[PDB]
């Protein structure tokens, strides 16, 4: 999320949760294989459907309801 | 060995098609200078770079 | 063969339709599972 | 006359946590030393099974090369 | 993290912390130079090691311990 060092010298940052078996997007450096970096983590459609409570199927976000 | 007695035709000469001044053998692409140890340590000659300045030749070795 | 555009009967060889689904275990995969 | 004799011994396998399920170790699994001075490899010949709720296991390894390097 | 506008018109969003000297991954638009966008921020191995309290060297995430 963010990481850095203060003027005093102490380091600060974050350690976002890591999960086994999750799907992660990867982007190779300079399009050279054997150099992966994870861009983000994306869940399955079933998992996303399970962890949301919105009953609406669709609609424009600008609507008040 | 082969003498000139067996030569039918010849086409040989110099060429400046390949010309490099700095040579290096970097490790695999996984290692990186910002998030790791030293990445490279090239070599050059002070007189060679005058005619061809900062002409690099990079090769990636999977063994290292 | 010229009759009714039959062509060569050997075109539809024995391997034309005979086949099977593709899966592992044919080379290297099965060597470690010989329990 | 006896030809060159293979080198062999025993090794200890250490797990991060105690084992929950009976795993399988097929023969021929390779073992290599990270030291640059001893690049010789080793391999197993007989399968071994790790019992459940285990923490360590001892298995035999046979050196491919034969001689003083083993 | 997220940004948008409400139906009333007021704008909402987030301003995640920015740090100097941090390493950031960049992806050029259409693979055309002179058009960078930062994808994410990645810390050094030493920094990550300093800002975590997990003593385990490794192990499957499914284990209860």
E56 and D15 Cβ atoms separated by less than 8 Å: no
Q: If you count residue pairs, one on C and one on D, with CB atoms under 8 Å apart, how many are there?
A: 6
D44 and D63 Cβ atoms separated by less than 8 Å: no
This structure's resolution (Å) is 4.4
Q: Do chains E and C touch (3 or more CB pairs under 8 A)?
A: no
Contacts 24+ apart (CB under 8 A), B49-53: B49/B21, B49/B22, B52/B19, B52/B20, B52/B21, B53/B21
Minimal Cα–Cα distance from A52 to chain B, Å?
37
From the number of C-beta atoms within 10 Å of its C-beta (0-12, 13-18, 19+), residue D42 rates as buried
Phi, psi values for residue E44, rounded to 5°: -70, 160
Buried b (16+ CB within 10 A) or exposed e, E8-40: eeeeeeeeeeeeeebeeeeeeeeeeeeeeeeee
E62 and A20 Cβ atoms separated by less than 8 Å: yes
**Terminal Cα-to-Cα distance of chain A (whole angstroms):** 32
Q: Do B28 and A34 touch (CB under 8 A)?
A: yes
Minimal Cα–Cα distance from A2 to chain B, Å?
16
Dihedral Cα B10, B14, B18, B22, nearest 10 deg: 140
d(CA B54, CA B56): 6
D48 and D25 Cβ atoms separated by less than 8 Å: yes
Question: By the CB < 8 Å criterion, does B30 face chain A?
Answer: yes
| Method of elucidation | cryo-EM
List subunits contacting chain E, requiring 3 or more Cβ pairs under 8 Å.
A, B, D
Question: By the CB < 8 Å criterion, does D14 face chain E?
Answer: no
Task: Scan for tokens 């010949």, then name that residue.
Answer: D45
Measured from the Cβ of residue A51, the count of other Cβ atoms closer than 10 Å reads 8
């Amino acid at each position: 999320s963010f990481i850095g060092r203060t003027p005093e010298g102490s380091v600060f940052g974050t350690k976002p949760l890591i999960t086994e078996g999750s799907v992660v997007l990867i982007g190779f450096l300079n399009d050279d294989i054997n150099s992966p970096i994870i861009l983000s983590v994306y869940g399955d459609n079933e998992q996303n459907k399970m962890i949301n409570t919105n009953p609406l199927d669709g609609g424009k976000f600008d609507t008040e309801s | 060995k082969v003498p000139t007695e067996d030569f039918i035709e010849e086409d040989v000469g110099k060429s400046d098609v390949e010309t490099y001044s700095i040579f290096t053998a970097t490790p695999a692409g996984m290692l990186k200078e910002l998030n790791g140890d030293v990445f490279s340590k090239p070599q050059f000659h002070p007189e060679l770079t005058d005619r061809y300045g900062y002409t690099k030749f990079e090769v990636e070795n999977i063994y290292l | 063969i010229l009759e009714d555009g039959k062509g060569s009967p050997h075109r539809f060889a024995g391997l034309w339709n005979q086949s099977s689904d593709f899966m592992g275990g044919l080379m290297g995969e099965d060597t470690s599972k010989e329990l | 006359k006896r030809q060159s004799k293979r080198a062999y011994g025993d090794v200890t396998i250490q797990f991060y946590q105690p084992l929950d399920m009976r795993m399988y170790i097929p023969a021929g699994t390779t073992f290599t030393s990270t030291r640059q001075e001893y690049p010789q490899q080793f391999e197993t010949l007989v399968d071994y099974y790790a019992e459940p709720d285990s923490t360590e296991i001892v298995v035999e390894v046979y050196c491919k090369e034969t001689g003083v390097a083993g």
